[PDB]
Write an enzyme that holds these catalytic residues in place. Structure first.
Site, short mmCIF file in Angstrom:
data_model
loop_
_atom_site.label_atom_id
_atom_site.label_comp_id
_atom_site.label_asym_id
_atom_site.label_seq_id
_atom_site.Cartn_x
_atom_site.Cartn_y
_atom_site.Cartn_z
N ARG A 124 0.84 -1.18 0.00
CA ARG A 124 0.00 0.00 0.00
C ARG A 124 0.88 1.23 0.00
NH1 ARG A 124 -2.93 3.12 4.36
NH2 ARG A 124 -4.14 4.61 3.11
N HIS A 126 -3.00 11.07 0.45
CA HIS A 126 -2.48 10.86 1.79
C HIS A 126 -1.96 12.16 2.41
CE1 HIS A 126 -1.29 7.22 4.31
NE2 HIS A 126 -1.06 8.27 5.08
N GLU A 165 -7.59 8.33 5.83
CA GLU A 165 -7.98 8.90 7.13
C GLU A 165 -8.46 10.36 7.02
OE1 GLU A 165 -4.96 8.25 10.14
OE2 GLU A 165 -5.01 6.08 9.93
N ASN A 180 -8.35 1.46 9.23
CA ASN A 180 -7.14 1.59 10.04
C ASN A 180 -7.49 1.48 11.52
OD1 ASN A 180 -6.00 2.09 7.54
ND2 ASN A 180 -5.29 4.18 8.03
N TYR A 193 -5.62 1.22 15.50
CA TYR A 193 -4.44 1.30 16.35
C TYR A 193 -4.73 1.08 17.83
CZ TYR A 193 -1.85 3.17 12.41
OH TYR A 193 -1.25 3.35 11.19
N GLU A 202 -4.19 -0.21 7.60
CA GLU A 202 -3.10 0.12 8.54
C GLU A 202 -3.31 -0.50 9.91
OE1 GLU A 202 -2.14 4.34 8.92
OE2 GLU A 202 -2.13 4.65 6.74
O1 LIG Z 1 -3.68 11.67 16.63
N1 LIG Z 1 -4.33 10.80 16.05
O2 LIG Z 1 -5.46 10.56 16.46
C1 LIG Z 1 -3.79 10.14 14.98
C2 LIG Z 1 -4.44 9.12 14.25
C3 LIG Z 1 -3.80 8.50 13.16
C4 LIG Z 1 -2.49 8.88 12.80
O3 LIG Z 1 -1.75 8.34 11.75
C5 LIG Z 1 -1.99 7.25 10.86
O4 LIG Z 1 -1.18 6.13 11.25
C6 LIG Z 1 0.25 6.21 11.07
C7 LIG Z 1 0.94 6.21 12.42
O5 LIG Z 1 0.39 7.25 13.24
C8 LIG Z 1 0.61 7.43 10.22
O6 LIG Z 1 2.00 7.49 9.92
C9 LIG Z 1 -0.27 7.32 8.98
O7 LIG Z 1 0.20 8.15 7.90
C10 LIG Z 1 -1.69 7.68 9.41
F1 LIG Z 1 -2.57 7.12 8.52
C11 LIG Z 1 -1.85 9.89 13.54
N2 LIG Z 1 -0.58 10.31 13.26
O8 LIG Z 1 0.04 9.81 12.33
O9 LIG Z 1 -0.04 11.20 13.92
C12 LIG Z 1 -2.51 10.50 14.61
#
Ligand SMILES: O=[N+]([O-])c1ccc(O[C@@H]2O[C@H](CO)[C@@H](O)[C@H](O)[C@H]2F)c([N+](=O)[O-])c1
Ligand SMILES: [Zn+2]
Length: 478
Positions: free
Chosen positions: A79, A125, A171, A312, A314, A385
């Protein structure tokens, strides 16, 4: 313990990247600036280590090594994202088409396919053209729709003979909430009292305008894909959305209704228009005339405008009820009347990763997937992701830095949790790990490392497999 062989036949495993975070060559091969180029250079104080994506992981030069690294692991798919301003240096057709940019992505695509790796391409992106920001404030203007559409079409024409999987936006939540509510990401807009302390913006209107425009640009682009390209190219087009999982702060019904509101605001914001043709009820009720409205024609266009949803995941947040403030501090952040925390009575919901917002909670992965199954008619989903980070630590010797047991543990539990959800009927077709390499982590710069492979920023961006790389090689066998 858990291997590829545990998963359905045909199931796709890959890794994910993005153009700004990986490529470098920011002012190379005719690339125009994006809002993140601008953002990092003009507001270095907004980046933890005052860094930028000028070089990043140098994938613009080193992409052959990247493909080699994926292949060694046995990855099925990659991706990645195309940089809008690498194709249209100032955003629009009339601004000129950059031939050298087209060549680069052709090279990347051809290299991937020569090694049996299928490309999944994200059109957007976050690296929005600066020229369109200057001209009409980018996504705050309905003019962005046609410029995006023209950009997308060039990608379909140039690449669609080989590329069979398309993602319009990555996102939009993150882009809109951080870019226009908190102002912590590019373009760095927000109300003065909000966190980014921005010079321009409105955290109560701008996030909604931005994201409304992304949804319309998405729908228009899907329609266009299906009308002109899908018949002869036979690819699929979708969109990538983030969601946390939300655990009610306590068993009270009002805390349960807060968790429901949190997910409506983060996720339903996009899902409801896509499945039901309008924004969530709680959003229209609470936001009122600050939330734009779809016309009848727009509603028809947005509803069902996808082949799959990229998802995605996390972490999880506790969700707690909040009284209306009540008054003159309207922000998307608080609009949900849900207060989000990762800690409850001094106890963290799960172990905290290097990112302060990232708490390890594999349970919520399953929970999210089943929520999607039960509430949205079980659509075709790819996990676009999933991953974790450790600190960038200049004092550790190289071989200690490669020992990412915490990452292995993260993937082990999340893949188990994904498997169980699939066994319980979740319509999931593939999984992409964030991410292949350490890279530019936005407002965190290089202080944080998400990669399955280490990048030595102080030694010509040399790649080194981490322990998790070996772990994935095992996992991906046969
Ligand atoms: O603060 N947030 O809620 C949030 C959510 C997704 C986020 O990021 C997401 O996942 C990866 C790791 O974070 C990034 O590198 C990706 O580009 C993004 F899709 C981020 N961020 O990248 O800072 C922050
Ligand atoms: Zn280089």
């Amino acid at each position: 313990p858990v291997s590829r062989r545990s998963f359905p036949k045909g199931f796709i495993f890959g890794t994910a990247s993005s153009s700004y975070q990986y490529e470098g060559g920011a002012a190379e091969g005719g690339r125009g600036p994006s809002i993140w180029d601008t953002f990092t250079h003009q507001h270095p104080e907004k980046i933890a280590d005052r860094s930028n994506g000028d070089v990043a992981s140098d994938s613009y030069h080193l992409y052959k090594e990247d493909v080699r690294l994926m292949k060694d692991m046995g990855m099925d798919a990659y991706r990645f994202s195309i940089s809008w301003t690498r194709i249209l240096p100032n955003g629009s057709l009339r601004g000129g088409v950059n031939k050298e940019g087209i060549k680069y992505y052709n090279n990347l695509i051809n290299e991937l396919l020569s090694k049996g790796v299928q490309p999944f391409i994200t059109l957007f992106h976050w690296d929005s053209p600066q020229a369109l920001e200057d001209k009409y404030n980018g996504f705050l203007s309905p003019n962005i729709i046609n410029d995006f559409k023209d950009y997308a079409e060039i990608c379909f024409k140039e690449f669609g003979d080989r590329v069979k999987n398309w993602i319009t936006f990555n996102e939009p939540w993150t882009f809109c909430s951080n870019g226009y509510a908190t102002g912590l990401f590019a373009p760095g807009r927000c109300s003065p009292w909000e966190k980014g302390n921005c010079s321009v913006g409105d955290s109560g209107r701008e996030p909604y305008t931005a994201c409304h425009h992304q949804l319309l640009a998405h729908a228009e682009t899907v329609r266009l894909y299906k009308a002109k390209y899908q018949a002869l190219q036979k690819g699929k087009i979708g969109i990538t959305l983030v969601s946390h999982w939300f655990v009610p702060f306590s068993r009270s019904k009002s805390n349960n209704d807060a968790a429901k509101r949190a997910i409506d605001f983060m996720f339903g914001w996009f899902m409801d228009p896509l499945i039901r043709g309008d924004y969530p009820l709680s959003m229209r009720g609470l936001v009122g005339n600050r939330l734009p409205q779809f016309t009848k024609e727009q509603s028809k266009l947005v509803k069902g405008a996808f082949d799959f949803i990229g998802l995605n995941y996390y972490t999880a947040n506790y969700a707690d009820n909040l009284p209306p403030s009540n008054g003159l501090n309207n922000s998307y952040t608080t609009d949900s009347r849900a207060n989000l925390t990762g800690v409850r009575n001094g106890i963290p919901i799960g172990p905290q990763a290097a990112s302060p917002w990232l708490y390890v909670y594999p349970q919520g992965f399953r929970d999210l997937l089943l929520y999607v199954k039960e509430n949205y008619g079980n659509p075709t989903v790819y996990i676009t992701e999933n991953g974790v980070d450790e600190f960038n630590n200049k004092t550790l010797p190289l071989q200690e830095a490669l020992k990412d047991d915490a990452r292995i543990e993260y993937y082990h539990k999340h893949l188990l949790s994904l498997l169980s959800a699939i066994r319980d009927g979740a319509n999931v077709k593939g999984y992409f790990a964030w991410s292949l390499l350490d890279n530019f982590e936005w407002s965190n710069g290089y202080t944080v490392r998400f990669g399955i492979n280490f990048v030595d920023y102080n030694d010509g961006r040399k790649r080194y497999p981490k322990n998790s790389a070996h772990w994935f090689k095992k996992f991906l066998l046969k």
